[PDB]
Structures are given as C-alpha cells and as structure tokens.
Amino acid sequence: TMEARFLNRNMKHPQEGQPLELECMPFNIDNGVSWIRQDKDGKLHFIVYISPLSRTAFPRNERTSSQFEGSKQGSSFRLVVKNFRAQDQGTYFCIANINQMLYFSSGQPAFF
Amino acid sequence: TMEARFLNRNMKHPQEGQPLELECMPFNIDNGVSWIRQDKDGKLHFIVYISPLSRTAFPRNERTSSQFEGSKQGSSFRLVVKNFRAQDQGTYFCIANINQMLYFSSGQPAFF
C-alpha cells in the first residue's frame, strides 16, 4: 500500500536548515504522483506532480519550484526540500490519480 | 476561492441517519472535482469524481457508489450521503485537477 516517508527512516523530525528528502512508494509505477503538504490547520497544499518519466509540474504562483525538487528514483518518487524552514512544516502525502480515481499514501509528519 | 460546505449553512453537525448534502464551489466550472473524506486519523479517502457534465467515477471496491451521490447543480458540485452513519464522519474536501496542478477547498468537518 502507498506510503510517504523520510528517506532516512531513522529520523523522527526534520532539521531546520537541512535538505529534506522524502520518498513516496506507489502501488503503481508508470503512473506519476503528486506531493502535497497539509498544515496543522488541516489546510492542504499542492507541491508538485511527478510523471513516470520524471517530468515535473509545479503550481503557477511560484516560490515552490525553487524550494522543492521532484524526481522518480528507480520505482519510488522523491521530494527534496532544499533548505527545510519553518514554513515547510506539515504532513506530507503522495497522491496517485489513475482513471479518475485517487489513491492516497499514509502521511509523513514533518515538524521540528 | 474553493470551499466545501454543508448545503444547510445553518447546521454545525450532520444528523445520524439523515441524508447529508454538501456543496463544493469551484473556482472553475467545466472542470470536474473529486470529493474526499479525511478521518480524524488524518487518513484520506476518495469518494467520487464529478465531471463538468455530471459524470461520476467511484472507487472500484464499492460500498461507495451506493452510499454517496455526486452531481453538478448549476455551477456548484454536490455530494449527498444517503443515510449519514458513524463511518461517514470526517472532514470533507473538494479537489480540482487542472493541467496536472491540484487545487483544494477548505474542509467541512462532519462529526456528530
């Protein structure tokens, strides 16, 4: 089943000012996934969609493309937060959209 | 901006055993929306995608199609829970997917 996790499964919380790598492991390859961040608010934010070919699409109002990197690394999807700051905290999820049905990963809490 | 709300804005909580109607008001028409439910868990569930033509697509493992009705009613999207039961409680959101970018509504808490 679908999970979003820290690349470093040993860490419990992200470090302020460090690069943060998350991994999404999708039940299906050759379907892309979207990374999203949920505030403690509950408020939901789209970060990036990664195609099976590692093509990325970011939101239009754009700090995002400069603060996050998306890629597919052999069967799994990756999201990198270049410098993890306070405004990046939240619960991160992977979403796959296959035949107009959505599939959600388990979330990864990322709070100092 | 995008909001999911009770059709009856006067009510604070859904009634056990009553039909529940929610409304999604999308920044864009002639794009469909997906309804999702989030547990208190944080766990996310796809309910249904409604096309701009009121065409519905439900999950494959299917209690869902029999317990929820989706439609577009003049500019807004509607989700009906036929008989609202304990297992239907959660925070409901609308999602639009336009050019591989996702847009999320504010959520509507639905708990007794």
Numbering used by the authors:
A (entry chain A), B (entry chain A): 8 to 119
Paper passage:
CD8 is expressed on the T-cell surface as dimers in two isoforms, the CD8αα homodimer and the CD8αβ heterodimer; both consist of an extracellular immunoglobulin variable (IgV) domain, a stalk region, a transmembrane domain and a cytoplasmic tail. Here, we report the high-resolution crystal structures of chicken, swine and bovine CD8α and confirm that they are capable of forming homodimers. All of them are CD8αα homodimers, and each CD8α exhibited a typical IgV architecture consisting of two anti-parallel sheets. Our results suggest that although CD8α and MHC I sequences change drastically during co-evolution, a few conserved key residues ensure that the CD8α forms dimers and interacts with p/MHC I during at least the co-evolution of endotherm species.
For example, cCD8αα has the longest C and C’ strands and a unique alpha helix between C” and D strands. The CDR2 loop of chicken cCD8αα only consists of two residues and has shifted dramatically compared with other CDR2 loops of mammalian CD8αα structures. The identities between chicken and mammalian CD8α were low; chicken CD8αα showed a unique helix and a short CDR2 loop as well as minimal inter-chain hydrogen bonding and dimer interface area. The buried surface areas (BSAs) of cCD8αα, sCD8αα, bCD8αα, mouse CD8αα (mCD8αα), rhesus macaque CD8αα (rCD8αα) and human CD8αα (hCD8αα) are 828.3 Å2, 979.6 Å2, 928.7 Å2, 1048.7 Å2, 1105.5 Å2 and 1026.3 Å2, respectively, indicating that they are tightly binding dimers. Especially for chicken, the four conserved aromatic residues contribute 161 VDW and 262.21 Å2 BSA, which account for 42% and 34% of the total VDW and BSA, respectively. VDW and BSA provided by conserved residues in cCD8αα account were greater than 42% and 33%, respectively, which were higher than those of sCD8αα and bCD8αα; these results indicated these conserved residues may be the initial key elements of CD8 dimerization.
